[PDB]
Amino acid sequence: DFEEI
């Protein structure tokens, strides 16, 4: 879900 930070 979340994209790479």
Place this chain on the structure above:
Amino acid sequence: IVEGSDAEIGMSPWQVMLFRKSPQELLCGASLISDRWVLTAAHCLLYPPWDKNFTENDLLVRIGKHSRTRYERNIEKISMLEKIYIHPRYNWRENLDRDIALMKLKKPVAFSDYIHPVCLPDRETAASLLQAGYKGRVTGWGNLKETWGQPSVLQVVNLPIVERPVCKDSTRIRITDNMFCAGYKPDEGKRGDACEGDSGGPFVMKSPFNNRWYQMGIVSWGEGCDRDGKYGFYTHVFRLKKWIQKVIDQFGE
């Protein structure tokens, strides 16, 4: 947010995302009140019954976001908390009485077109706008459905303040002067609510006197999301204002 809409770009520049470093996850909403202070609901940090007790450490603050998930390459700013301060008499044991907390950023953040602080109300301002019938605005990246997804983008809803008696009669939980409820009456056939994952976000109003946005409440608790005869409950910011003045003046920007 239930029955809301996508936010416009730069519509809520004080909206802050409370983000979990690892597992990297969206904890709650929050709001920017200056370049070093963030406002949120105390229960986003500390909630013993669910074994939740986050440290400065366990956290990240994302400011200037639109997309829930994507890393907003030259728009958002991520920060580190220098310190966490919870309302000493926050009641997690019974009703989330005084559901408020402040976060002081490690380093000051710079304002841009996508990042701008919201004002805190004064006594006068509170008095004239905090009235049953008056509409406020709530934002979040929370549940779209009580149970059914998760939005792609920041959602928004405008909800009317509800008179206390109706607030009180809608639940078995004990309401206090530090709370206010909002939403439509089932007859008013118009809907919408904040929902889980929406906490710590801001309930805001635009003053007709000086046309500045003020934060009146903090998304706190409810029962289900968007159900007839039920209302969202918000932390009464004006009411906890002294506490706020106090920590800022005691150890801050």
Place this chain on the structure above:
Amino acid sequence: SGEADCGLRPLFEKKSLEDKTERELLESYIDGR
């Protein structure tokens, strides 16, 4: 009562542009300023 330049949005108030539903808030304060 907030920051200083608090609550004035760079892309709205600041350029004199209104958001698509702000008017609903204003008319409830039995119509704004």
